[PDB]
Symmetry: C3
Subunit: 401 residues, 3 copies
Amino acid sequence: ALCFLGSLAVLLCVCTERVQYYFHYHHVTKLDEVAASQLTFPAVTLCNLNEFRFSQVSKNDLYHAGELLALLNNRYEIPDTQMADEKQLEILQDKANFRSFKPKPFNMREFYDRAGHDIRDMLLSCHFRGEVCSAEDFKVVFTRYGKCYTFNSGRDGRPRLKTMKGGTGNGLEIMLDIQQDEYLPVWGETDETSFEAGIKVQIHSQDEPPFIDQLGFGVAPGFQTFVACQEQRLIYLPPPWGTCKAVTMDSDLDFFDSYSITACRIDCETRYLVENCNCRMVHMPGDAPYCTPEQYKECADPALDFLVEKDQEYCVCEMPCNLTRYGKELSMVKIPSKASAKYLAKKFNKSEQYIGENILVLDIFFEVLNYETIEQKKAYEIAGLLGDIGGQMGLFIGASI
Amino acid sequence: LWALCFLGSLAVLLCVCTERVQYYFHYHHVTKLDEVAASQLTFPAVTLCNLNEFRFSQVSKNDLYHAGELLALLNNRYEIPDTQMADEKQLEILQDKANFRSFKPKPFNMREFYDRAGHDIRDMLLSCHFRGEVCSAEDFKVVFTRYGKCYTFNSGRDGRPRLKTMKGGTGNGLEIMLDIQQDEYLPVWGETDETSFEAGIKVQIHSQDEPPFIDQLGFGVAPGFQTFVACQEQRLIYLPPPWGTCKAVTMDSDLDFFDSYSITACRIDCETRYLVENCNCRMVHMPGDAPYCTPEQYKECADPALDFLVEKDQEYCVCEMPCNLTRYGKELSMVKIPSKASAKYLAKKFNKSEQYIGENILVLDIFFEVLNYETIEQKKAYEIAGLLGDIGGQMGLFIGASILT
Amino acid sequence: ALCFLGSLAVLLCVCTERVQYYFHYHHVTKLDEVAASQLTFPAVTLCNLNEFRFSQVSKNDLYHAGELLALLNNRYEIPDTQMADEKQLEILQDKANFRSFKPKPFNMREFYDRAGHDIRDMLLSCHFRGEVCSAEDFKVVFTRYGKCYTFNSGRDGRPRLKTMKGGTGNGLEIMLDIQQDEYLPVWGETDETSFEAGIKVQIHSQDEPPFIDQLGFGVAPGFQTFVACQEQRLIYLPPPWGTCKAVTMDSDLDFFDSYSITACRIDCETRYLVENCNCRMVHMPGDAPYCTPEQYKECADPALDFLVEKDQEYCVCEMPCNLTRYGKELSMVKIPSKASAKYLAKKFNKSEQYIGENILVLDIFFEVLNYETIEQKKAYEIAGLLGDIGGQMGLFIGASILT
Ligand SMILES: *[C@@H]1O[C@H](CO)[C@@H](O)[C@H](O)[C@H]1NC(C)=O
Ligand SMILES: *[C@@H]1O[C@H](CO)[C@@H](O)[C@H](O)[C@H]1NC(C)=O
Ligand SMILES: *[C@@H]1O[C@H](CO)[C@@H](O)[C@H](O)[C@H]1NC(C)=O
Ligand SMILES: *[C@@H]1O[C@H](CO)[C@@H](O)[C@H](O)[C@H]1NC(C)=O
Ligand SMILES: [Cl-]
Ligand SMILES: [Cl-]
């Protein structure tokens, strides 16, 4: 009959349509809602928006950094501009008196470490799953805001805390004093001053460095702020199926052991400033020298701004393959109640007015022992291609007998 | 040979037959996501609670005598404490009520106290509209929670029909103006489970088939703001063992004190059991027929026990996912109230000071972004019916090949 | 044998089960996260909550609109209710003196345009991806709130701005003065007055008109407000697979180029008011006459409220098939810090108290170079039905070859 010619014509033609499918390298995305007996609680990094406490700024610091913080002009004088408070201008005309004064050596990293807000003074109260925690439970981390702190860091081999139930009771609750009376006076616009009072916060996997100035959320004074979270786990496929970049212990990055958009970007930033400024900012990795006030103002602040705003050539940062995202729903209530104000004032030896202006509470917790997963899977595996081609080859071989 | 082209035909069906049985016995599932365009949505329940549990003006000498220690207004010696964290004018009203010379205790009930001294929705609710229809205090059913006397709008309880949203946007939702009544806030002289540092309300948006769990799962709304809450209905289906870990939701709940299964119901059940076992009482907000805890039992046994339970213990409370489950995505945003312009009008309209309006008025708009719910349904991967429809057709061609040769 | 009796019965039976599947018209929904080198930054429309600046309300305006703004009663005189500010009641008793006064002609649209807050006065500062922008980067748009503004409108052939990187640095940051001292005094409840200070904001596709009073979010004075966004792209299938309405070269709407729930609704609203009131509101399209204060109060305000609240018959607006959604996470910090207050006061020649009451900052930006897609795809295509019927027709033609 015609059947052996028309069985070879259809087999070899349909066989090359299951090979044109494979070589397109399709993927398919599986969504799931996994019920979880327990979840790993994330890292919570948090920063005061004020970088330098006024009371920690020495004559020597003012001498070196005063122009960078717009407290001095280029002539080491307190400016013509009377943005100053009367009582503040007295304290500062003193510090800014440089007659007979001999400069001592100065280091931006030291200054940040010494003058940065102290978690020990800021942290009025802290609880996790009902257990008390202290300033010892927060590891120091440097960010563009300066001396910041990470709760449940996972760093120093201490074990990562876990959430076993839904609701606020199985989460973090911290009361802070943002210390507005230590806020450095703002007499000019710079990258180191802000118009704002409160803290920046980032909730992130322990495996990701914080990127708090770009990806953080804000928490205001005078409110208890509830943050209800949801763990989202995302898997992506490498080339040729997608564009992602393996998360392993061989990062392939100058300054990081594991790949992450954040690590990739901090790497790229650090490289760029070292190349163009011959220094790194106090928060960047490597062993390059720390920038001086002059270098911050003249080279580094502008360069870093140029980089994260304009330049699109220098920073090529691809998706990681493993990635953990946190959905957040914020809500707030006022603190303090008219009733509670006097108790809080007395409990902390502050004015009632001060409590209103400086106290906040932050509750971070999960809605439900559940994570969304969104995994990209290979559409048509190479194994399953030879398991069709094996069965295509087996019946045209059964047509010859 | 011609019988061997048959022997390679039998080896393939018996081998592939036990690979489609090893697949079935793995009990795989597959998850279908969908974005159904909806003519109509059932508007959820909205439970809301003042953060202040007891109005100061409702606390009698008898109440202060029994509960004063629990609310840190008294020490264990029925005296106003050493530490003068009191306001001068406030302390005057209380010196009187706290005078217990000659006084004989009269009978006292935590449930009654909560009911009598709790904020009245009738006094709190300055204004309320749903899809442009007016509603009053009559539209809010009373419910007891750890915060005390709370209220649920669109409860579905008392056979009243569940309200529906037919368009997106704020205009087809709830808008309520409240006065949180800070001047009735019980003075806070010490830390307890019944006092808070905060003013405002807690709110929970939830299915009518869920009891509220407002202290754990609620969101906050502050005074001095209009707060927009833009919602999205999410419907989740899960598969029971052996495919998953869920426990079917029907009207045969299988729970001591509840109509339908829900993590919330399951947890309140488990909490009620635990306190009865370890305290020989229930809290005013728990179901069952056990006696209500006394202030003494609240302070000594129940408050610490319930805290122990929801914080530390992971032995006692095994509460599994329901199979049917309704979630609400929310985006909150706010504007200031009142404007400098509106302040005098609101003061006059409600016979309050301008300062008072600033401190006590809030507006809440709850509404849906779009006539749409997300569904996320787990479906059985390989049904048992479709297994007999493969193994019957696997068995039927080699029995067709042995009949020929 | 019995094989030809059993083999045509199985073709015809399986054939009509794969035709009962097709005629059910199933669909399947594909979810994805695509890694994006770049995204189109959306439109950002924003409105002051105060519709008419006090200082722009002329004697002529008060004469025509005073009742609509509850500054006059139905006898076009100032009410005797002593619930004005003392100094405001003076300025207004003056304006409200109509002895000797000759009416000049009046237009709600002109009034809105003239008395609406000026983006040029409100916009203290504005940056996108670090580049400076001015009042000229915001196109005027009329909404129920009145004179509003859209950033990155895409209108007037200007090109749509793009986001290249995640985080606040690659987004919009605007500092506003909401001008509370220009807020029209509230002596009564109407659809044009509000109890609230701040702005309403909507983030939306450039292809969608804003629907800011219904679908907007609020931004309060005295805070920097971070809005972190996520682009969600939704595809739906038309009947018989679903209920959507394909976006074409013919919008199918009297007054819009492209279909969109928002366009569809504004269309339907415009039709309804013209039919029932013989006017349109200043923010509606078409060529109908603009409503007068009297028409606003008596017919149009109540009609539009009736429409968006109660009526369920008149406005049949079905899902578009192509559709862009923006997930948002808001957070805020206080402005100004005790430290910054005097600098801001001096920089803008305002009191320190004023700064607290009127200044806000808004940052709109994307968390990650990623959009979620949710595409409905046809379950069983009509092509693939003839490719199964062709393979069942091929083996009983192999069974009639034997017999
Ligand atoms: C990476 O993802 C896989 C899931 O495919 C998971 O098993 C593993 O825990 C993840 N590892 C890291 C380092 O993120
Ligand atoms: C409390 O603070 C005051 C400032 O108001 C200070 O002078 C005093 O020494 C402090 N006293 C105690 C008891 O801490
Ligand atoms: C207004 O309130 C006060 C109570 O503080 C009262 O003296 C006055 O009589 C009230 N008038 C009313 C409700 O009209
Ligand atoms: C939908 O329209 C948008 C907006 O212009 C465009 O990006 C997209 O390509 C369209 N896609 C489909 C499948 O209609
Ligand atoms: Cl700091
Ligand atoms: Cl910017």
